[PDB]
Write a protein that binds this ligand. Structure first.
Ligand SMILES: [Zn+2]
Ligand SMILES: [Zn+2]
Ligand SMILES: [Zn+2]
Ligand SMILES: [Zn+2]
Lengths: 195, 195, 195, 195
DNA sequence: GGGCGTGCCCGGGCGTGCCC
DNA sequence: GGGCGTGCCCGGGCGTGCCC
């Protein structure tokens, strides 16, 4: 009961995610729709669009949390490796958190008091007049390969729309690989998929 | 009267088990429907799905217990071998218990006061809206071959749906082999079966 | 400095070891001169002859100690596995000791206060008028394969002739394998040697 | 002035090092005379022989210290990476130290008060009558590749014979690679050398 | 962008107590 | 005495940050 659900849930507000088109072997961030997987470099900007069919009420929040994808590792909390944990904080993000948000004055970093899982939360803001969507800029602060952290294990990022009390309004998820060469690794994984 | 029943019993709630599809000679966990037998590596995650036709009431519990499959050994309590008993506790599991549950804050480990058999219990949780089933992650903390423990003897795991008082609501079981090479050993035992 | 020397040392008294001729796949004990290696079954009698060119003085003692043969394991104390440690004492031998002596009223079992290594000691007795030699009956109380004990690692037995203070008068050694089928395993290891 | 000398110096006592012959792709430890380089697995035993032409006086000590081989990295202290630092102490070795000695009751672990470099020291012991030499068992507690530690950089181990005050009596050194497959990597580096 | 690292995954096959 | 177990040794080969 300590691993959060990843089940997609558009909910009453029609909550969906969108991703940008990207460029290179070493592109900073690129999303594979075939794999529903984001490939990015350590600490680079990963834009994620939030789409809704209708505006949720005031006090709605947007939470991001990583979990390991594989059954064998689901119950292990995703955290930064010891090496990077001792390195690059912005004053708000605790050094142990993998996922950060940039460019948001109201960001909150949470350590669940029962599961000890990390997450990062911002208020939901509606798009400008109109718009079609709102964009959050996430950063992942370890490579998937980091020894003593993710240790080459795939993760999912779970994005939830929640009320102020943490009740679920919507949920979406995508896989992530943080690596040196996102364009190479996207092409490799897509070719293995179509094989 | 000191060996528990293994008789299948879907009961009033239509209680059934499901297992995941698995990958390798040394896959960490794989289930053989032909043998109704789980093959897994020591301490690796063994996901088991709980299916019900209708939700049981609050206070319902899910218990797992191991017994030796063969008549000659049924009356012997299944325990960890002395070597592994002295090794890896998570703070909750007594070191003598073969079966653990991972990722559940409400787990209880029991030593029957009359039979001295071990079991591990968690509360039953209904699936998310939606979902079709609930999944528990079990771990087996000795190999089937462990000298002074299972000593190469096959075991059954008995999963029971129970009320708070221990009254039976449903029961299912499967055989287990804990070994270094679950893929090899599943294939070997399936080939011997079809011979 | 915590691993004892195995260097052969006949010393002033011309101290040498002798071994009996043996019979079968599952002979209880058999010695390979080609390998300088004793093969025996768990807890069976292993006769070792003590030869001297001249009688050492009163108070001389005979000590036996096991060490792992391989550099990678030399610094680990040789002990019985947890399973057998909890099983068969004769009233004198501590349950953790691998090597016992049978049929000697003056046997002593020692745990070194600095290295924690085990040994077993008897007084040296001269041969009868015649013889030509004196024989000690040793027992090894785990198989080489025992999990959590020797764990398939080869050992040496070091036999030392010592004065009452532990000063060295002579030293000899031989390799040991404790196993179910000493005759099979001797033939296998001798054939691998001559290959 | 904060990087120690590696210059060979047999000194008045004719101090030299010797290495054992080794076996496999994944042999636990193997020494390349062509490269004057030790290849070993993390935490496995690395035997090093100490040879002298004459016995040094009482109070003589043997120190081992690691430095980075390349000019670009020489001035950086060699330490364990953060991941392994937080893992496996024997009660004596500080968790930050790369080099340990096993099986010696008089080992000392030092952090230089001026350079902050680590070293491990044992008393010099003369060979037995027999023997020709004395052997020390070293362990290296990180892989050469460890992120945040050696980070794929080659190191030298410097072994010094010293009086009680730290004055130099003799010095020798060898390169070290700690890796998963010492046999493979020795063969690879020897082939590159002869190219 | 091409290509070398290097811990670890992968299947082949040898152990070794015990069944026959 | 013949022969099957079964954890682990063995070499082949894929990773993936970083050198070129
Ligand atoms: Zn990291
Ligand atoms: Zn066990
Ligand atoms: Zn034993
Ligand atoms: Zn390390």
């Amino acid at each position: 009961s300590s691993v959060p659900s990843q089940k997609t849930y558009q909910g009453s507000y029609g909550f969906r995610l969108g991703f940008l088109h990207s460029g290179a072997k070493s592109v900073t961030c690129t999303y594979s729709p075939a794999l529903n997987k984001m490939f990015c470099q350590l600490a680079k900007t990963c834009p994620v669009q939030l789409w809704v069919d209708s505006t949720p009420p005031p006090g709605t929040r947007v939470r991001a949390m990583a979990i390991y994808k594989q059954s064998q590792h689901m119950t292990e909390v995703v955290r930064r490796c010891p090496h990077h944990e001792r390195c690059d904080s912005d004053g708000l993000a605790p050094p142990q958190h993998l996922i950060r948000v940039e460019g948001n004055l109201r960001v909150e970093y949470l350590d669940d008091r029962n599961t000890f899982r990390h997450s990062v939360v911002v208020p939901y803001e509606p798009p400008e007049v109109g718009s079609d969507c709102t964009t959050i800029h996430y950063n992942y602060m370890c490579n998937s390969s980091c020894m003593g952290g993710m240790n080459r294990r795939p993760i999912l990022t779970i994005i939830t729309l929640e009320d102020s009390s943490g009740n679920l309004l919507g949920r979406n998820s995508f896989e992530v690989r943080v690596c040196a060469c996102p364009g190479r690794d996207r092409r490799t994984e897509e070719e293995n998929l179509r094989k």
